Amino acid sequence: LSVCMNSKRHKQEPGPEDELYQECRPWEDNACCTRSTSWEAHLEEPLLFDFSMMHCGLLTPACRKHFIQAICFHECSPNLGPWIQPVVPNGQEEQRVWGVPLCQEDCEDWWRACHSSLTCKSNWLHKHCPAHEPCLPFSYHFPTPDDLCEKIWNNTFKASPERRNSGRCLQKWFEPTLSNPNVEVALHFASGLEVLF
Template sequence: MRGYSLLLHLLLLASQAAAQLQCQSFAQIYDNGTELCENMWGDAFKVVDNISEAYTMWFFDDQNPNAPISQRLHPTGNTSTCNLQYLHKTLPTAEGDDFTECHPWKEASCCSSNTANVTNLLNGYGPGYRWDRCGTLSQACERFFVQEACFYECSPHIGLYRRYGGHACDPASGQCTNVHNASNPGHNTWEVFKMPIRRDYCDAWWTACRNDMFCSNSGGNYFACALIPTTPNVTTPPPEVITNETTEEKEVLAPGLIALVVILGILLVAVAGFLCIVYRREKSGNPIFTPLKDRESKMPSQPSIAMVNGKVDV
């Protein structure tokens, strides 16, 4: 979610982007939560099993569980400033009672209440970064996107992992720097690099979204997808949805089939009963159906003209 104005970074990914937006289910794009967290945001996050050495993007405790993680991993790191800079504040400060969407960071937030609402979190970086470009997400799935957006915008701890100028950078990797060089056009102040995220959180995200549709271009890379016009081409519906639709069709058709079988059964019983009656009448010599000649022989003869005129010929 890092904006249309981040053109330099996006142009680096342009060669990876396809001409048309491709949409598939999360389960088809990512095999598991690890792939989701590590592919969707490029190099921003890495998944870690040890929860004592990894961050979570959301919490309900009174105390931020990420604080002791930062103290353990980066005891000299500074979380009293908002090291990321894009829509962020300079310092993490308390917000008012209207700060409800990203409430875990209410007491020390790098984002304002104006940024921290669903409308701005969804639209703040332009239409390319909307998470619903392949269709409306389920509430369970969308909630994780809101959590990630709040985490990025509001957490002071994520700034430790700023790619250019972050405390956590290992310069030996050659992929980040501890110092931001403002004169270097390749440096920015918003990008995150290799922040450790708990595996159980990423797995929960994948489970919540597995049947929802998302951009599958470049392996589901959010930044590459942002370059593509929003004209989705849904090539392969999610298998679970197909299964559900098939089940629903069966559930709709089943009562009709049962009714048809019942009606046919009643008709067969009625026909069989009628044939039995016909057979018994035939056996008793009083058939229901008689030959036409027999009927004519039993009919009275036609009266003569004289009888009709009231005269009797002698």
């Protein structure tokens, strides 16, 4: 069984979407996001989410695409069940995800595409960069892809030591023509991976 986290944006239960904006397309088969949310995920300064683009200067389109894919994954993936946690324990009205293990390629590609960009914080989870915070290189706040994946959204993701096709990590994006590779990874974690064997 696949579920969606409780929030003011996510759908109650996973369901197919007829039209999702470009980067959120691979989840059209079974999504937790509405079409309105997927369009919001592509804005340069999105306001609907708890995240916020804390970048200064110019963000390259390749770097921005990885952020959008990460937002699509967080908003549309029906396979985040085993990492759902309450925003305020103990109550399940507001829910988040914690330590979703992203494969190394997803973190590395994200880190390399954003390597030349500038940011002002290492943790973007709550909307604009204040003038007193210096605009430092991406590689300073995130010296490794591990630091980027884990710190960018306050441990929303975990930097998995595994790589793609290992059955032990998730991809924040995949080709829409391909079958969703995260369905059986999430079920693997739901079946006791890394806590019981």
